[PDB]
Amino acid sequence: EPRPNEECLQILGNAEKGAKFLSDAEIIQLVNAKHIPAYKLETLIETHERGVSIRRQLLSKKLSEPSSLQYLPYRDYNYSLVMGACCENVIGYMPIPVGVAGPLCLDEKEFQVPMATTEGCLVASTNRGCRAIGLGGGASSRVLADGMTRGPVVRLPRACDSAEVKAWLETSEGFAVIKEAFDSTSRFARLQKLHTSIAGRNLYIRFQSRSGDAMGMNMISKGTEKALSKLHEYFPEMQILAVSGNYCTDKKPAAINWIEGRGKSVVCEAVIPAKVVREVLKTTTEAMIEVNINKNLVGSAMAGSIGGYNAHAANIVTAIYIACGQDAAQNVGSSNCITLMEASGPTNEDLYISCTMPSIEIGTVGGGTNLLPQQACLQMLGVQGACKDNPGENARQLARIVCGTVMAGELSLMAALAAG
Amino acid sequence: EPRPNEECLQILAKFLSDAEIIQLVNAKLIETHERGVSIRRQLLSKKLSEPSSLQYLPYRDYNYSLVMGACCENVIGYMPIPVGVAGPLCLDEKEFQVPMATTEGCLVASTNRGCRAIGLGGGASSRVLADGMTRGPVVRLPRACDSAEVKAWLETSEGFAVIKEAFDSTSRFARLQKLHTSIAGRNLYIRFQSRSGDAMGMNMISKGTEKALSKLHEYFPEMQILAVSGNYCTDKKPAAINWIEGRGKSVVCEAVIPAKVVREVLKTTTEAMIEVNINKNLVGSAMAGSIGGYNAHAANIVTAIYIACGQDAAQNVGSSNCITLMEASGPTNEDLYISCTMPSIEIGTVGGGTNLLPQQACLQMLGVQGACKDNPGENARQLARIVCGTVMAGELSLMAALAAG
Amino acid sequence: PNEECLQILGNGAKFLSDAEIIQLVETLIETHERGVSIRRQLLSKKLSEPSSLQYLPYRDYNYSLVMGACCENVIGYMPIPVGVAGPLCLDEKEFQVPMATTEGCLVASTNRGCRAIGLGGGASSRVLADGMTRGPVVRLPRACDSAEVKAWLETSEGFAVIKEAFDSTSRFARLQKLHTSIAGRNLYIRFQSRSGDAMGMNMISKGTEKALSKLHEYFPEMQILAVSGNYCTDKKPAAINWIEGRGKSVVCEAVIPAKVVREVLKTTTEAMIEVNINKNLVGSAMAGSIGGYNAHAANIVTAIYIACGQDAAQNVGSSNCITLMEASGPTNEDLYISCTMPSIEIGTVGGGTNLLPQQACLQMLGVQGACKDNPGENARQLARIVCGTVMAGELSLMAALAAG
Amino acid sequence: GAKFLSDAEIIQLVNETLIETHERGVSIRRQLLSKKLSEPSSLQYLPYRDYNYSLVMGACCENVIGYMPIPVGVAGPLCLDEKEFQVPMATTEGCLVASTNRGCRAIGLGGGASSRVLADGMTRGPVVRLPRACDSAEVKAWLETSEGFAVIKEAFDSTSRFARLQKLHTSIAGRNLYIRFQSRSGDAMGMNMISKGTEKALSKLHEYFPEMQILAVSGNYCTDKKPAAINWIEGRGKSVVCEAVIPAKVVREVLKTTTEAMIEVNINKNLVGSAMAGSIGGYNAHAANIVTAIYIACGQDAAQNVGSSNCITLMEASGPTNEDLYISCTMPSIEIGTVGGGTNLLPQQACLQMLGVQGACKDNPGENARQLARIVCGTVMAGELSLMAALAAG
Ligand SMILES: CC(C)c1c(C(=O)N[C@H](CO)c2ccccc2)nc(-c2ccc(F)cc2)n1CC[C@@H](O)C[C@@H](O)CC(=O)O
């Protein structure tokens, strides 16, 4: 029997009763009367799972089809780590199939690479690329740079004033003061040379710094706030218009990420014997190079691409990112890649391949990497959490694995297009 | 208990044990699909440096029937992505509860705040401006003089009619629009474009493209199909051609937020919002050398909806293309007009990950699951409008947070 | 005098002296050259060094065709050295290409590239498209309204009305399919049309003004914000010109025998291909280039443009070029080269092509003025010559870079 | 020997240095050229007599058959940094000089413009190649150390007095390494000076990495005379900014428009319009018109208008009543000089002398080139003001 709303408020308020005594229908009555907020259903109710169940029932009534959420799962999931960290207004979870592609022979080691995707043939094709690399002695990679960025926009009264601030940041003394404020916000914060650009009285400042094993967006944002506050002391007429003025650039296509790099800049390479190209990849070295020149270079050129000189790097990046608790929206910039191919060896029949990815935004701590299922996929690769002995080594290793797996995916798709 | 290799083969699955099946694989089929995943996980665990790595990677009680031979291979489980709800989104005199699969804290709550501002301001209106998935093969003739001849042939009415007949014959939803061609010496990049009903249409347009190129091969036997995709589509890479010509659904959305609502809900002013939009989304993206990235975080919303609704999440590269504009509005010039224009939303409600039941639950929330029989492509066009509208909600909230500081 | 100078001017200016007219301070003065002299004297007193104008020439130049047409506030002319590179063997013909430049070695290097092409059987070119553009921005009250205008222009009926207004302005005004693009309540409309032998910026601007007035009849709430909303795009870098084309889209090609690559170009075919891939494709890609997949197309375009009375500011878009190179022939030692230039903005009538010195350089190439029997043939031929000469320039410079 | 022989004697012998005199050498080359043209009378109105060919031969042009007169107009005074400039503009486009002159008048009545040079450094961007990507990565890291950069900086700076190497920018593409050398070049544009420093620098780098192959001294990473995002973001040559405030009264009477109309056209044309067109660095009306006209008049490399005209034009409301028009133009890659190339010729030096920037500034190296870059940016702003007013007024 559904009790009145006045009586239900007294039971929940009591210390030795709680929501346990109230029913499903009674809690739904309190939320609709604005006594209890729907987004705090986890804290008020005895368990996290029951809070999600109540929000699903509230949502179902609003929908045109009441049984819409029937096959959206929610039970037996660890909501404790998601609440107040990863998601709000939670109505369940979305299971994404995870396949394995390996072994990927990279830097004299072997990796079993997890790939969360619903695209048919993606895992198996990437697996074929790994097999070709394995029979060809393996791949080698190098991290060329490491530093997450934030690109605020500030505004001085005049262009003459903004020019003065740019010159001030360029002196050794001015940069030293701003570096002191930036680095004071975190243990891993080490500010590199600034990258500034004027647009009239506007000034776009590109802060860059390592962030341990974190992706580092929040850490670099906090350091940027303290740095601009210190700059405000020397220039009180400056106005911080936005902590992100799209000069970072985060989650949008931008030539600045392609040229300067953002996060981890990485390069991989391998040599596939002529026999391996024929038997595994069902093509030739000559055919692979001709498709790479006219698709990945000339084709992308005709399309007006900036940073998209590859076949499907975004497929591999997105799959690994979802599996390993990364920010999947950062696939925009993280998938930037140029794939090159040429002839090699004594008879000029072997296929040299390289992929260069200047802006892989990645981390093994914080965000979705705090969740246990996501940590399982990181644990496969041996990069879960922060490396204490060498800060940033786990995040750098994951970036190398992404670049190497992208190269495996490039080998297989380009071989499929060449053979027809 | 473990039997020899000879005794295990004569019996062979249900009779044998889990330990015996592992011995058969290493020596150099399964009853249920769930059991097949379990055997793959045990073999994988021995190869890893930490054998208990897959402990918290779930796999049991998941419907693998629709995944095997369709969506994923070498399957070792599934990855649960938390789904949240942001709504109601008042769009075209309707109300939508938008599912958002993400692990970024505050994304769903912030998008929900943007929805609240739109709802208190009378709502949003959107229009689909274009619709047509593309494929951009590269072919090659002996000379540039020959590739020019093929370009001119495709430009004639009768030449285009022959290629359109071959293309449209592959599917009942296939309707070939005007071709866009581009020469690079003896190379010729042909951009086929066509509606695909409610499907995203990559497989449908690829099939029509192969038949179209085969027909072109009859008139020009010296032509060589180098690649069915020559990166002129362009699929899953940044490209100005998608920005200018469009790819999939081109969409526009708009709303007017009362000055009262900008102050109380968004904690800012209309003047501050316009100033940040001009200097971040236009001038800022311009200084960064952006093509199509004239927005705050469209990619966050696109990606979250895409994962929840069984889309190709890798297509967020081009689908996130967006320009966000803001100006003063109303009789006192204090209200905030906002528009978002997304020329290349690549989306669908049939095929791929939308065949799975959990993904279909999120599509069913929006009322766009499956193929619309009475009006082909209506559900896919509706989902594209919902994405553009939710992106606009996300733009309002994030831009308000940046302006306020 | 002071008062007497005004009375004589009422009747003429020939009776008054140079110092008298300056005391007071085009149509007032009798001759055109005399008007330039008085303007130079007034300017000299304003300069910190009045002797600056000493070596800027002005006498004995035909100012009749420049006044009220090509330049204002004229104080003389700037002599640009003109050299000749050729013969350029193009489409079974031979061309002597004039090149106005002050860059040392440019003409001689381009001349070497021509020599390589000529010993290898010659080049062949094709015009792929033709149509100058104008890209206005209009504005409707809402995005729902701008979408209504876009759909209306896309129908056969709505396009027919706008095409009729556009085509009524000029003989050569023939409107091709429109290319529109929405940005909220804004609508950017790309009008395109051939323009005979003229570059066609004034002709397409007149057709666009009439087209937007006719569009306002059907949509009275529409506001023409600007006749150019940078969607053309004219004289700025833009991916739309690269993809859709602007003016003449052209391609050239040639096979250079292996012997010619060694003796004339002092390099090999293999060396040339490796530099082309890693400089013009990969190098330009790393630099974030849109349409700049070449060595120095801009050098050749600019030089020919100044010599032949073109708008040299249009080298921004006209120099768009992708240069490709691969192995060729039975032994795979011959060098196949092609250049593709999708947006050569060019003309042989109007503007600086009305001046006699500029017409001399056009007459060398056989493309001066309008082709009567085949309208647009002279402008198309000049675009083919530009693309062919660019290819000559690519061959020589790329060979110099490969050899080190 | 050559002086005694007639014009007709040398021409019939065939069917540079031997002629001795310059003008007669151009005359003989015109006659040989005439017999190859379908219309030999084409050269009639192409002038050549009475021109100083002494500075052109072996410096600026080859196979010379005359000169091309380009009309030069004057737009001014341009009130810039408490000074006044009469800006020469070589063009054949009707109304360009007069429109630019109107923009100068609007700036003059509004108190004048102010400019600042933000950066200075011509670049060359060679491509080198190591055997593997691991090797090219090693060279990148070596150049990034303080000791490695010091050795390369020593070889670069030894080639010239003005050669002072700045921080290198490198980019890997597999086994390729693209290295962007940058340095001031006094008052010269500096393409020749930076190329010589780059050659000696790569030779020193080869001592430490002998398997390195210099594929090309320019690998299109400079980037010279092609559109490139690297020039827009990092700058090339002179990076400059200008600004001015135009009173509401001046916008109405001189420019025939309003401040509100000018800002709306600038937002929707120069920002949103250029954005829709897929532009990188083309956020302006016609900076290229002004850059090209000044460049041809002042002996610059006109082909460098590709990168030099990169410009973003911004406009907003200003003043107490918010009715005045603030304008700014930012041009990050003005490639320019007042010594070398076409600036060696006397007519071109006349136009440089009008602006007071001809030749090399002895007391302050690079001051004349910097001043001319400020004048270009300021004149571009005048051109932006006038054309934008014409479009706004319809
Ligand atoms: C990525 C998967 C794997 C793939 C493959 C592929 O790799 N196939 C090989 C050979 O069958 C393979 C090998 C082992 C196991 C299974 C399959 N072929 C295609 C494909 C389809 C239609 C079409 F018209 C062009 C390519 N795709 C989908 C391509 C898309 O995800 C990005 C693509 O569109 C990006 C681009 O190339 O522009």
Ligand SMILES: CC(C)c1c(C(=O)N[C@H](CO)c2ccccc2)nc(-c2ccc(F)cc2)n1CC[C@@H](O)C[C@@H](O)CC(=O)O
């Ligand atoms: C949208 C999310 C949640 C968000 C918000 C945000 O929406 N905040 C408001 C106010 O707190 C809010 C309102 C209701 C509920 C919860 C939170 N503020 C930031 C943020 C952080 C640091 C920083 F330096 C710049 C912005 N972010 C991260 C956005 C990023 O994913 C793309 C962003 O980096 C793209 C860009 O603007 O460049």
Ligand SMILES: CC(C)c1c(C(=O)N[C@H](CO)c2ccccc2)nc(-c2ccc(F)cc2)n1CC[C@@H](O)C[C@@H](O)CC(=O)O
């Ligand atoms: C075309 C001109 C003449 C040229 C040549 C050239 O053609 N040289 C050959 C040498 O055999 C030649 C042949 C016959 C007659 C005379 C000279 N070599 C260079 C050059 C200089 C320095 C340097 F570091 C990189 C190239 N340049 C300057 C080109 C520039 O205007 C655009 C260039 O910067 C575009 C680019 O490649 O990025």
Ligand SMILES: CC(C)c1c(C(=O)N[C@H](CO)c2ccccc2)nc(-c2ccc(F)cc2)n1CC[C@@H](O)C[C@@H](O)CC(=O)O
């Ligand atoms: C600057 C020149 C002179 C100019 C002017 C101009 O300045 N006009 C004013 C008012 O009449 C004026 C003031 C004083 C003296 C003489 C004339 N109006 C146009 C023009 C023509 C057609 C058309 F459809 C759009 C504008 N143009 C041509 C500009 C072109 O070279 C680049 C332009 O196309 C770049 C662009 O805006 O996209």
